[PDB]
């Protein structure tokens, strides 16, 4: 969804893969705080206690037993932290049975979306460009640098497949709430698959640097129910 | 060793919780004072 | 071991031919993690008298006071060392008021 | 005289020249950051009228001036040239005449960079000069051609300097200095030189490929012709990830030397320290494509690069703990270098935890090309490498120059830069987790909150830099009077508990390196009769 | 060959190493003339390129 | 800190005008669009920072 | 006379023990105070769904 | 009533440039070279009309016509 | 040796070089080459007469740098045993960097060869390119380069043995056997069907062999200055560092050619 002023956390999830992104960050952050709590505590204690310590024990160098532990102490927390990372990685590529595919090709300084599926009664691909709304025509009540004139519509409870590329230079499709990010190279076709589970509008942006119109490239996306998607694709 | 360590250890944990709350919790002051 | 430690600094202090060596050995004896035994300290006092330096003998107990880590153990070292300290003439820091 | 500075062969004069070029480029590159912060202070184009160019150009200039013209000539060319011969015991470097060309090709690069900025186009491509945007169709001027030529000049300078340091360390040591018994700073310089030697040629090959493709019509990365713009990413980052370790390994030696002088106790487990330092350099060559997670690699190679990058934390952590174990028992002297080292220990560990958080390929799809990564690498660069540079200056300057620097006026600078940089770079992680992208001049309104706070903090750091410049002026002028009055601290090691004040004055420096035993300033011909060890 | 009599000349000369050989004047003087043209001519075209006039 | 903050405000005077969307009535109107679309179920969509 | 030894050893142990314990609460408050709160409010909206 | 191309062995990964290209080559070799049956050729036709950018098709249509198509349709 | 005499000499084995103007003259010649080349590429000058001038000054200044090195090693004699080890070690670290430049060129070849691009044919080499035939003419260059390593070897050992007619003859054959490689490579370049502009295949092909071609011309120059120094009694029987680094350079440059003969010629057709 939209970013919030003075906000410090993830945008509300709308996909199961974003929950795993949210869930994995906390499990690593569960362990990042122990180390943060350990090094910082030993820092404060040593500074306060031994700054006031005249005598220095200048013969403590070997430490046979301690060195063995904190050499292997990180090696175990790395093991626990690395399990949920691997299952998440290999369940994100489940493209076994999708239902409809969307291509997202960006001309420099904008995006062109075209639906290669032929479910529509026209039998033709539906393509339309998406430009930012300039400040001269910014209608009263719209979001600045975030709202476009034409958007893209995706059904809910549907396994969607995205295939992205580029024409002039590299530009990357990105929507923070959904957890999708693909480079979109000018000669390749990289793909992802995400499942959306609640209606609403998500805004994203263009990430890779692509010239002088980099800032003027939003990606407006909203999810509607399965019927309303059908009375939208036919009319387009 | 319980008697000696108590006089020095436990007060520091309270001082500990203060400084770390300042270095990490400072942006909470700006948001509350006048997120406006 | 502790007994090996005590018996080897008991020999180091007996061989200290100047005021640089006495202040070098005592900086080594109090640099170890263990608090030295009262037998060790007595030999250190004799060394200071041998090189004729009053202020290093005063700093012996000052080093011990921060080293002994106990308010009764400092009194424990105090009692056994009353005879040698009074015979030598070393004043404590608190008594001296410097 | 012209002969002394234009025909230099003495290594110390070349070190002074390297230092002098670093400060000028440092001030030049830190004003572009000020303009960037002023432009990002509020939504809408406030100061730069509407030019999206001259914003990317300023960012490129800032990054290049900070990396290739401040840290490289100061840590490697400034400290490495002045201190490695003295601690090893060599009178000068092995190849004294190419040591001068290793420096004099740097000012030519500045001319090439400035004239690149002044041509009507400019180079708005980022410091990672990716082919399709910096090709001839999108950047049609001679600007990026001149920018590329500067990179070649810096690369040749670094390569010829690196060859000098390997031969100097290997066969110009004194009568007792076995390769096993070295100071840790020399070890850091040695490993850094070996990384540079093996990493620079690939960057040169890729950059020359880009040049030939723009002007000589070679389908090296042109899509129409079978070229691949992703091959450039491999070629560039193979020099890129190892690079983030050339800028921190000499920063490790400085911290290792600082924390064992103002804490009067030697380093805990030195051989493990050199083992860990070498392992970071060796294993950083096996992790380069974590900068290319979302480019569309295979699933199995992403798992490999995720597993190999986390191993970096095993030796790195060893260095963090062994620094906390050499200060546990000793007596601590809270001076300015010690305050910089203590701040480094905390801020670099805060940066490294975020780094390990970024190392997972499955999570990086939410944290890549956002201000999260900017906040990450500004902890290890602006608080990890800059702080050790300040600590090294305050550590060695009175010995090198012979002029003290008014302690109480330097601790003010330390506190100002501390609480100024923390204000700039801590809120960034909040902007990054909401999805604020990189390399944009103007942002949606909802991001205006922490950006204002970060912009306020830039002025504090700029004021601290101005105060540092005044400290330099007050050190060079009437600096001989600073050690007569009570403005500065003279001795970096106080006497021991049972050491009298009249015995400390016959053994003033109890150091483990030859650097602090030399006269201040050191003589032109330091070592006539070689020094003997062990 | 001539190395022995060239050794006696290069040593005990009290001159810069590039001026010691008696035949050095033939290389150095024409070099500085061409060198000056090489490092000054490209600097004249800089303001012309900044304005954008192509010759 | 006083001089830095004081000098920060002086240079801010020699700058351009604010965006027309920071009126607190634009920001209040931004919420009706978000609230009708159910922008954020857990957390908010206040968009108010005037 | 009691042979006072190993004052550093246990002082080292308690320092490391406290660091994990103090870091334990910091870690535990994140999981069961903040993160667990987020999950419940997340599930409620899905529960009504 | 929604459906799309299924998961394909040999092309199981993110990069899908060859998967688009092979369907175009297969389709023309399905028709010009032994096009005895119309039905099986449509599997490719619905597969490159999907998953492939539009402008690539017109570029490959001009290169085929002119005789400079890299793929061997015959 | 008297204590007074020993103090009239260096106490260390390392060589202290007088201040010299060439490190900065070459630096200024590199800016003129960098600044003139950037202009002629887009106009702003009109003809390529300033690029030639910059190259001439760059080469001539480098000659005067090497002119000083031979003077302080043959007439002043500042290359002690310790100094000679550093020069050999420095050259060995310089050829490793040279190899890794080629390693970046093999990586560029394997990237487009193992999985050929779709804008090319489905094959490799691309459709419609007549690649160089490995058996007709390049095989002549392979036998020539191997024979160069065999005739520079006994020229090196004959110099150690003490006879100058076999040492001088080995280099003369070595030089002319390298020039034949350059002229034969020149013939193939001007008779090839494809150009540097022929897609990606011509770029990687002419960058690997072209970089080697430019390295062979610098090898002949290095061989030429060893024939002048040997004929005029510069190289001695036990001290020749300018010749040892030449033998390592020609042996390393034969291994690189064999690698370029297996993957660019055999494996690439
Ligand atoms: C000096 C510079 C420097 C240093 C030292 C590092 C160190 C590390 N960096 Fe990186 N990095 C950069 C400079 C640096 N980096 C720059 C400039 C970029 C962006 C370039 C660009 O894209 O423009 C970048 C980007 C970057 C990326 C790519 C992000 C992206 O583009 O999406 C990744 C990916 O993993 C990464 C990871 C790491 C890791 C794991 C370390 C490790 O070395 C850190 C290890 C540290 C610790 C482990 C903490 C200390 C250890 C302990 C406290 C012990 C206990 C630890 C455990 C129990 C685990 N950083
Ligand atoms: C050494 C490297 C270095 C240093 C020191 C800095 C210092 C600063 N940088 Fe950063 N920065 C980069 C390397 C560095 N930077 C890189 C690589 C990028 C990526 C560019 C790209 O995206 O292409 C970047 C991008 C970057 C961005 C993001 C731009 C974008 O993505 O669009 C911003 C935003 O505010 C920023 C601001 C600052 C500020 C305010 C400071 C300073 O104000 C912080 C405080 C530090 C100082 C004031 C310096 C003090 C020291 C000296 C001046 C030297 C003299 C001292 C001694 C010799 C001891 N710079
Ligand atoms: C730590 C050292 C200091 C760190 C930097 C603090 C910067 C504080 C700051 O920027 O606050 C500004 C806001 C202004 O109020 P606002 O709610 O953001 O409204 C917008 C008004 N503008 C920004 C257009 C002027 O006003 C505030 O919210 C002021 C809050 C100040 C809180 C105390 C300082 C921070 C904690 C210590
Ligand atoms: C090692 C780790 C390095 C740092 C990593 C980055 C931080 C990761 C997130 C942790 C902090 C989460 C704080 C909890 C949180 O978001 O609560 C908000 C704090 O807001 C605030 O602004 C308070 C900030 C104080 C922290 C409440 O406020 P809100 O964000 O809902 O307010 C929106 C008004 N429009
Ligand atoms: C893990 C995280 C570590 C964080 C940094 C810790 C820094 C403090 C290090 C303290 C010194 C360690 C050390 O070697 O001390 C040993 C005791 O350690 C101990 O008692 C620690 C043992 C491990 C605790 C769990 C001495 O060992 P020693 O008593 O054998 O020395 C007999 C000599 N002659
Ligand atoms: C790339 C340039 C070549 C680098 C590889 C050769 C470096 C190792 C050999 C070496 O030390 O001699 C150098 C002479 O070559 C040179 O560096 C002269 C060629 C310079 C080419 C410039 C383009 C520097 O020797 P030195 O003169 O620095 O020290 C002389 C002390 N006896
Ligand atoms: C660009 C890359 C440039 C690479 C330069 C490589 C230089 C290698 C040799 C380094 C110095 C070796 C050395 O000291 O040999 C001296 C002669 O070498 C010399 O003076 C060799 C100069 C000839 C090298 C020509 C290379 C092509 C340059 C093209 C332009 C750049 C005399 O030493 P000695 O021990 O033989 O003397 C015996 C006296 N009794
Ligand atoms: C941090 C929070 C923010 C603090 C802001 C301070 C503003 C300036 C005040 C100056 C006061 C002054 O001058 O302090 C002087 C004090 C007392 O010195 P003294 O006992 O010799 O007495 C002086 C009179 N004879 O010394 C110090 O500072 C030294 C202690 C510094 C400790 C490290 C500092 C660097 C940060 C490290 C990272 C954090 C570690 C802990 C992590 C939890
Ligand atoms: Cu398009 Cu960035
Ligand atoms: Ca602005
Ligand atoms: Cu990296
Ligand atoms: Mg990217």
Name the 3-class secondary structure at D398: helix
Residues with CB under 6 A from ligand 6: D 95-98; I 15, 17, 26, 62, 65, 69, 83, 87, 90-91, 94
Q: If DSSP codes are grouped into helix, strand and coil, which group holds residue C4?
A: helix
How many angstroms separate the CA atoms of I189 and I196, rounded? 10
Total domains in the fold of chain I: 2
Q: Which residues of A sit in the known binding site for Mg(2+)?
A: 208
Q: Which residues of D touch B (CB under 8 A)?
A: 422, 426-427, 430, 449-450, 453
Report how far residue D48's alpha carbon sits from residue F28's, in angstroms, rounded to the nearest whole number.
Answer: 29
How far apart, in whole angstroms, are the C-alpha atoms of residue D261 and residue D399?
15
Atom 27 of ligand 6: nearest residue by CA position? D97
Residue with tokens 């400072």: B26
Q: Give the structural domain span for I93.
A: 79-269
Using alpha carbons, list the distances in angstroms from residue A21 to A85, A87, D355, D476, I39.
9, 12, 16, 55, 51
Nearest to D152 by CA among D221, D213, D105: D105
| D1-517 fold | Cytochrome C Oxidase; Chain A (1.20.210)
Q: Where are chain C's structural domains?
A: 1-98
Closest Cα in chain D, distance from residue I87 (Å) = 9
Contact between I13 and I82 under an 8 Å Cβ cutoff? The reply is yes
Q: How far are the Cα atoms of I112, I134, I188 from residue I130, in angstroms, in the given order?
A: 18, 12, 13
**Separation between Cα atoms, residue D23 and residue D29, nearest integer Å:** 10
Chain D interface, best mutation among E43, E49, E54, by max D CB count within 10 A: E49
- Residue bearing tokens 């994995």: A24
Give the angle A169-A171-A174 at the CA atoms, nearest 5°. Answer: 175
Tokens of D194: 């070996």
Contact C36, C29 (CB under 8 A): yes
Burial of A201 (0-12, 13-18, 19+ CB in 10 A): buried
CA distances from D359 to D286, D293, D352, I191 (A): 14, 10, 10, 52
Residue pair A81/A28 in contact (Cβ under 8 Å)? The answer is yes
Q: Is H46 exposed, middle or buried (0-12, 13-18, 19+ CB in 10 A)?
A: middle
**Residue I67 φ/ψ, nearest 5 degrees:** -65, -30
User: Of the candidates A190, A156, A195, A166, which has an alpha carbon nearest to the alpha carbon of residue A178?
Assistant: A195
Give me the DSSP letters along chain H: ----PPP-TT--SS--HHHHHHHHHHHHHHHTTT---SGGGHHHHHHHSSSS-HHHHHHHHHHHHHT--SS---
Distance CA D246, CA D76 (A): 9
Q: Are D186 and D84 in contact (CB under 8 A)?
A: yes
For chains E and I, tell me whether 3 or more CB atom pairs sit within 8 A of each other. Answer: yes
Tally of structural domains, chain H: 1
SS3 D110: helix
3-state secondary structure of A209: coil
Taking the C-alpha atoms of residue D379 and residue D421, their distance in angstroms, rounded to an integer, is 9
Which residues 30-49 on chain F approach chain B with CB closer than 8 angstroms? 49
**D165 closest CA partner among F34, A62, I90, I37:** I90
Residues with CB under 6 A from ligand 7: I 59, 62, 66, 69-70, 73-74, 79, 87, 91, 218, 221-222, 225, 234, 236, 239-242, 245
Interface of A with C (CB under 8 A): 54-60
Q: Do G7 and C33 touch (CB under 8 A)?
A: yes
Q: Are D213 and D135 in contact (CB under 8 A)?
A: yes
Give every strand in the sheet of A100-106, ordered side by side: A126-130, A111-115, A100-106, A159-166, A190-195
- Is there a contact between B19 and A44 if contact means CB atoms under 8 Å apart? yes
CA D317/CA A79 separation, integer angstroms: 15
Cβ atoms within 10 Å of G49's Cβ, excluding its own: 9
Question: DSSP label at D364?
Answer: G
Question: D264-279: buried (b, 16+ CB within 10 Å) or exposed (e) per residue?
Answer: bbebbbbebbbebbbb
Residue H58 forms contact with A (CB below 8 Å)? no
The angle at the Cα of D519, spanning D514 to D522, to the nearest 5 degrees, equals 85
What 3 state SS string does G1-49 have?
Answer: CCCCCCHHHHHHHHHHHHHHHHHHHHHHHHHHHHHHHHHHHHHHHHHHC
User: What is the per-residue DSSP string for E1-55?
Assistant: -THHHHHHHHSS--S-TTT-STTTHHHHHHHHHHHHHHHHHHHHHHHHHHHT---
Q: Is D328 annotated as a binding residue?
A: no
Rounded Cα distance, D259 and D344, in Å: 11
The token pair that represents D58 in the structure block: 């300023």
A27 preceded by a cis bond (ω within 30 of 0): no
User: Does D96 touch chain E if contact means CB atoms closer than 8 Å?
Assistant: no
Max intra-chain CA distance, chain A? 88
Contact between D492 and D262 under an 8 Å Cβ cutoff? The reply is yes
Kindly state the helix (H) or strand (E) to which residue A172 belongs, with its residue range.
none
Residue I267 to residues I117, I124, I204, I255, I260: CA-CA distances in angstroms?
A: 17, 10, 14, 17, 10
Q: Does A48 touch chain D (CB under 8 A)?
A: no
CA–CA gap between residue D332 and residue C1 (Å, rounded): 29
Every domain of chain A and the residues it spans: 1-96, 97-235
Residue D32 phi, psi dihedral angles, 5° rounding:
-65, -35
Measure the CA–CA gap between G40 and G26, rounded to whole angstroms: 20
Instruction: Tell me the CA–centroid distance for residue D160 and ligand 7, in Å.
Output: 16
Pairwise CA distance, residues C17 & D241, whole Å: 59
List residues of D with catalytic annotation: 62, 92, 127, 157-158, 241, 243, 245, 256, 290-291, 316, 319, 438
How close does chain F come to D460, measured CA to CA in Å?
6
- State the residue range of the domain holding G39: 1-49
Method: cryo-EM
Residue I254 shares a structural domain with residue I126:
yes
Which pairing describes strands A190-195 and A111-115: parallel, antiparallel, or unpaired? unpaired
The pair of three-digit structure tokens given for residue D189, joined into one six-digit string: 């310089």
CA of G6, closest atom in ligand 5:
29
Residues 6+ positions from D329 with CB-CB distance below 8 Å = A50, A53, A56, A57, A58, A60, D265, G8
* Dist. CA D273–CA D253, nearest whole Å: 10
Distance CA D466, CA C1 (A): 58
- Tell me the two tokens of residue D143: 């600007």
D439's tokens: 């390399």
HSE-up of residue D130 (Cα within 13 Å, Cβ side): 19
Q: CB B27 to CB D453 under 8 A?
A: yes
Residue A196 parent element (H or E): none
The CA–CA distances, whole Å, from D493 to A125, D395, D403, D511 equal 78, 12, 18, 9
Closest to I111 in 3D by CA, of I2, I241, I204, I207 = I204
Q: What beta strand segments (E) does A33-81 contain?
A: none
The range of the structural domain enclosing residue H62 comes to 1-74
The alpha carbon of D449 and the centre of ligand 3 are apart by a number of angstroms equal to: 9
Beta bridge partners of E16: none
Q: Of the ligands numbered here, which is closest to the C-alpha atom of D41?
A: 10
Pair H25, H47: CB distance under 8 Å: no
Neighbours of chain D (3+ CB pairs under 8 A): A, B, C, E, F, H, I
How many Å apart are CA D85 and CA D89, to the nearest integer?
Answer: 6
Q: At what angle do helices C71-80 and C38-51 cross, to 10 degrees?
A: 60
Q: Is the peptide bond before I125 cis (omega within 30 degrees of 0)?
A: yes
Q: What is the 3-state secondary structure (H, E, C) of D73-93?
A: HHHHHHHHHHHHHHHHCCCCC
| D448-476 vs F2-13: helix crossing angle, rounded to 10 | 120
Cα distances (angstroms) measured from residue D396 to each of D16, D389, D405: 13, 11, 12
Using CB atoms, list chains with 3+ pairs below 8 Å to chain B: A, D, F, G
State the distance between the two ends of chain H, measured CA to CA, in whole angstroms: 37
CA D304 from chain centre, in angstroms, equals 29
Give the torsion sign (CA, D369, D370, D373, D375). positive
For residue I75, with 0-12 CB atoms within 10 Å meaning exposed, 13-18 middle and 19 or more buried, which class applies?
Answer: buried
From the CB of A40, is ligand 8 less than 6 Å away?
Answer: yes
Residue with tokens 């700029």: D462
Does I75 sit within 8 Å of E42, measured CB to CB? no
Select from A33, A60, A197 the Cβ nearest to the Cβ of G27.
Answer: A33
For A138-163, b where at least 16 C-beta lie within 10 A, e where not — what string? beebbbbbbbbeebbbbbbeebbbbb
b/e sequence D352-381, b meaning 16+ C-beta within 10 Å: bbbbbbbbbbbbbbbbbbbbbbbbbbbbbb
Resolution in A: 2.6
Judging contact as 3 or more Cβ pairs under 8 Å, the answer for H and A is yes
Pull the structure tokens for residue D265: 């106790």
DSSP strand pairing (A152-155 vs A221-224): parallel
Residue D223 neighbours by CB under 8 Å, 6+ apart: A186, A187, D132, D229, I119
For F14, the token pair is: 């020699």
CA distance D193 to D278: 12
Q: How far apart are CA A221 and CA A1, in angstroms?
A: 9
Separation of CA G5 and ligand 5 centre (Å) = 14
Nearest to A57 among C31, C63, C66 (CB): C31
Maximum separation of any 2 CA atoms in chain G, in Å: 75
* A5 vs D202: CA distance, rounded Å: 44
Residues I95 and I168 in one domain: yes
Alpha-carbon distance of D122 to D113, in angstroms, equals: 10
- Give the CATH fold of the A1-96 domain: Helix Hairpins (1.10.287)
DSSP element (H, E) containing D500: none
Contact D264, A56 (CB under 8 A): yes
Chain I residues with CB inside 8 Å of D171's CB? 82, 85-86, 89
SS3 for chain I is CCHHHHCCCCCCCCCCCCCCCHHHHHHHHHHHHHHHHHHHCCCCCCCCHHHHHHHHHHHHHHHHHHHHHHHHHHCCCCCCHHHHHHHHHHHHHHHHHHHHHHHHHHHHHHHHHHCCCCCCCCCCCCCCCCCCCCCCCHHHHHHHHHHHHHHHHHHHHHHHHCCHHHHHHHHHHHHHHHHHHHHHHHHHHCCCCCCCCCHHHHHHHHHHHHHHHHHHHHHHHHHHHHHHHHHCCCCCCCCCHHHHHHHHHHHHHHHHHHHHHHHHHHCCC
**Mutate: best of E34, E38, E47, E49, partner I, most I CBs <10 A:** E38
Q: Which residues surround ligand 11, an ion (CB under 5 A)?
A: D 241, 244
Q: I60 and I86: one domain? A: no
Instruction: Name the burial class of residue I97, with classes exposed (0-12), middle (13-18) and buried (19+) by CB atoms within 10 angstroms of its CB.
Output: middle
Q: Is F27 on the interface with A (CB under 8 A)?
A: no
User: What CATH superfamily classification does A97-235 receive?
Assistant: Cupredoxins -  blue copper proteins (2.60.40.420)
Domain C1-98 bears CATH identifier 1.25.40.40:
yes
């Amino acid at each position: 969804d939209v970013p919030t002023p003075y906000a410090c956390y993830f945008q509300d999830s709308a996909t199961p893969n974003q929950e795993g992104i949210l869930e994995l960050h906390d499990n690593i952050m569960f362990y990042l705080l122990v180390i943060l709590g350990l090094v910082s505590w030993m820092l404060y204690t040593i500074v306060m206690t031994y700054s006031k310590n005249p005598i220095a024990y200048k013969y403590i160098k070997h430490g046979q037993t301690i060195e063995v532990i904190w050499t292997i102490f990180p090696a175990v927390i790395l093991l626990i932290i690395a399990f949920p990372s691997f299952i998440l990685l290999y369940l994100c590529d489940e493209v076994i049975s999708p239902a409809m595919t969307i291509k997202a090709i960006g001309y420099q300084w904008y995006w062109k979306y075209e639906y290669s599926d032929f479910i529509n009664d026209s039998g033709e691909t539906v393509e339309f460009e998406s430009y930012v709304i300039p400040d001269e025509l910014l209608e009263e009540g719209q979001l600045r640098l975030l709202d476009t004139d034409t958007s893209m519509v995706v059904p809910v409870d549907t396994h969607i497949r995205f295939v992205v590329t580029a024409a002039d230079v590299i530009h990357d499709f990105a929507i923070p709430s959904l957890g999708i990010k693909v480079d979109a190279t000018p000669g390749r076709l990289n793909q992802v698959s995400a499942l959306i589970q609640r209606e609403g509008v998500f805004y994203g942006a263009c990430s890779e640097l692509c010239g002088t119109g980099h800032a003027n490239m939003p990606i407006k996306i909203e999810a509607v129910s399965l019927p309303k998607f059908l009375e939208w694709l036919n009319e387009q | 060793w319980v008697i000696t360590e108590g006089r020095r250890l436990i007060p520091e944990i309270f001082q500990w919780s203060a400084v770390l709350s300042v270095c990490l919790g400072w942006p909470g002051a700006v948001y509350f004072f006048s997120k406006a | 071991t502790f007994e090996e430690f005590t018996a080897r600094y008991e020999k180091e202090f007996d061989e200290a031919y100047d005021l640089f060596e006495v202040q070098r050995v005592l900086n080594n004896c109090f640099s170890y993690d263990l608090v030295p035994a009262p037998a060790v300290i007595e030999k250190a006092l004799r060394a200071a008298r041998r090189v004729n330096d009053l202020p290093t003998a005063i700093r012996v107990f000052e080093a011990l006071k921060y080293k002994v880590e106990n308010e009764d153990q400092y009194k424990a070292y105090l009692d056994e060392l009353k005879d040698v300290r009074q015979e030598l003439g070393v004043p404590l820091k608190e008594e001296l008021f410097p | 005289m012209v002969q002394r500075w234009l025909y230099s062969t003495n290594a110390k004069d070349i070190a002074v020249l390297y230092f002098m070029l670093a400060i000028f480029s440092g001030m030049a590159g830190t004003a572009m950051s000020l303009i960037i912060r002023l432009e990002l202070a509020a939504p809408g184009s406030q100061y730069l009228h509407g030019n999206s160019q001259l914003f990317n150009v300023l960012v490129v200039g800032h990054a290049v001036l900070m990396i290739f013209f401040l840290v490289m000539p100061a840590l490697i060319g400034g400290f490495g040239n002045y201190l490695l011969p003295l601690m090893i015991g060599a009178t000068d470097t092995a190849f004294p005449r190419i040591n001068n060309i290793a420096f004099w090709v740097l000012p030519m690069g500045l001319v090439c960079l400035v004239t690149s900025t002044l041509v009507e186009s400019g180079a708005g491509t980022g410091w990672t000069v990716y082919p399709p945007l910096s090709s001839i169709q999108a950047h049609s001027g001679p600007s990026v051609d001149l920018a590329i030529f500067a990179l070649h000049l810096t690369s040749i300078s670094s390569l010829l300097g690196a060859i000098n340091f390997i031969v100097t360390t290997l066969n110009m040591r004194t009568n007792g200095m076995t390769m096993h018994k070295l100071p840790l700073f020399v070890w850091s310089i040695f490993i850094t030189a070996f990384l540079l030697l093996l990493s620079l040629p690939v960057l040169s090959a890729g950059i020359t490929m880009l040049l030939l493709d723009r002007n000589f019509n070679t389908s090296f990365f042109e899509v129409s012709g079978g070229g691949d713009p992703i091959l450039y990413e491999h070629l560039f980052w193979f020099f890129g990830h190892p690079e983030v370790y050339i800028l921190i390994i000499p920063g490790f030696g400085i911290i290792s030397h600082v924390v064992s002088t103002y804490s009067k106790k030697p380093v805990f487990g030195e051989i493990s320290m050199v083992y860990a330092m070498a392992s970071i350099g060796l294993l950083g060559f096996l992790v380069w494509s974590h900068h290319m997670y979302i480019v569309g690699l295979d699933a199995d190679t992403r798992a490999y690069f995720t597993s190999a990058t986390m191993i970096i934390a095993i030796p790195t952590g060893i260095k963090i703990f062994s620094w906390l174990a050499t200060i546990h028992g000793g007596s601590i002297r809270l001076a300015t270098p010690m305050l910089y080292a203590i701040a480094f220990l905390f801020l670099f560990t805060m940066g490294g935890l975020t780094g390990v958080a970024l190392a997972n390929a499955s999570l990086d799809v939410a944290f890549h090309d956002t201000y999260y990564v900017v906040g990450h690498f500004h902890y290890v660069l602006s608080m990890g490498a800059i702080f050790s540079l300040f600590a090294g200056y305050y550590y060695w300057s009175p010995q090198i120059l012979g002029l003290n620097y008014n302690e109480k006026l330097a601790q003010i600078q330390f506190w100002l830069i501390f609480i100024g940089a923390n204000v700039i770079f801590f809120p960034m992680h909040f902007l990054g987790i909401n999805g604020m992208p990189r390399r944009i001049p103007d942002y949606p309104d909802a991001f205006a909150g922490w950006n204002y706070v970060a912009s306020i903090g830039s002025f504090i750091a700029t004021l601290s830099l101005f105060l540092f410049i005044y400290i330099l002026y007050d050190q060079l002028v009437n600096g001989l009077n600073n050690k007569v009055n009570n403005k500065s601290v003279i001795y970096n090691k106080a006497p021991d508990f049972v050491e009298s004040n009249t015995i400390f004055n016959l053994n003033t420096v109890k150091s483990s390196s030859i650097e602090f035993l030399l006269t201040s300033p050191p003589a032109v011909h330091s070592f006539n009769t070689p020094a003997v060890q062990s | 060959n001539k190395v022995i009599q060239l050794q006696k000349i290069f040593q005990s000369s009290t001159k810069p190493l590039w001026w010691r050989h008696p035949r050095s004047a033939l290389y150095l003087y024409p070099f500085y003339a061409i060198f000056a043209v090489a490092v000054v001519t490209p600097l004249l075209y800089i303001p012309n390129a900044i304005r954008g006039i192509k010759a | 800190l006083l001089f830095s903050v004081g000098l920060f405000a002086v240079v801010r005077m020699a700058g351009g005008q604010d965006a027309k969307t920071m009126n607190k009535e634009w920001q209040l109107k931004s919420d009706e669009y978000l609230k009708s679309k159910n922008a954020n179920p857990w957390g908010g969509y206040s968009q108010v920072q005037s | 006379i009691a042979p006072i030894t190993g004052t550093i050893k246990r002082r080292v142990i308690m320092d490391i023990v406290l660091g994990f314990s103090l870091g334990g609460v910091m870690a535990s408050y994140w999981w069961w105070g903040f993160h667990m709160d987020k999950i419940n409010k997340r599930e409620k909206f899905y529960a009504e769904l | 009533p929604l459906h799309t191309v299924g998961f394909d062995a040999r092309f199981p990964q993110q990069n899908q440039t060859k998967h688009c290209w092979q369907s175009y080559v297969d389709y023309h070799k399905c028709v010009n070279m032994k096009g005895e049956d119309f039905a099986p050729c449509k599997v490719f036709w619905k597969t490159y009309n999907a998953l492939c950018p539009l402008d690539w098709i017109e570029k490959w249509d001009d290169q085929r016509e002119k005789g400079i198509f890299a793929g061997d349709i015959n | 040796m008297t204590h007074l005499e020993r103090s009239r000499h260096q106490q260390h084995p390392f060589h202290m070089v007088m201040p010299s103007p060439w490190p900065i003259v070459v630096s200024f010649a590199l800016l003129s080459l960098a600044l003139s080349t950037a202009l002629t590429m887009h106009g702003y000058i009109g003809n390529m007469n300033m690029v030639y001038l910059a190259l001439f000054v760059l080469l001539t200044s480098s000659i005067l740098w090497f002119r000083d090195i031979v003077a302080e090693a043959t007439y002043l004699g500042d290359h002690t045993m310790a100094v000679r080890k550093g020069i050999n070690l420095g050259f060995l670290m310089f050829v490793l960097s040279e190899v890794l430049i080629f390693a970046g060129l093999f990586w560029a070849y394997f990237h487009s060869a193992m999985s050929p691009d779709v804008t090319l044919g489905a094959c490799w080499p691309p459709v419609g390119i007549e690649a160089v035939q490995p058996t007709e003419l390049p095989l002549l260059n392979t036998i020539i380069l191997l024979s160069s390593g065999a005739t520079v070897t006994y020229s090196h050992h004959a110099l150690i043995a003490g006879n100058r007619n076999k040492a001088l003859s080995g280099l003369l054959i070595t030089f002319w056997l390298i020039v034949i490689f350059v002229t034969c490579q020149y013939i193939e370049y001007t008779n090839a069907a494809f150009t540097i502009s022929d897609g990606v295949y011509g770029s990687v092909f002419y960058a690997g062999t072209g970089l080697h071609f430019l390295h062979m011309v610098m090898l002949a120059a290095m061989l030429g200055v060893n024939y002048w120094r040997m004929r005029n009694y510069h190289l001695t029987a036990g001290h020749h560092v300018g010749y040892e680094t030449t033998i390592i350079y020609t042996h390393v440059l034969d291994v690189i050619w064999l690698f370029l003969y297996v993957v660019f010629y055999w494996w690439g057709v």
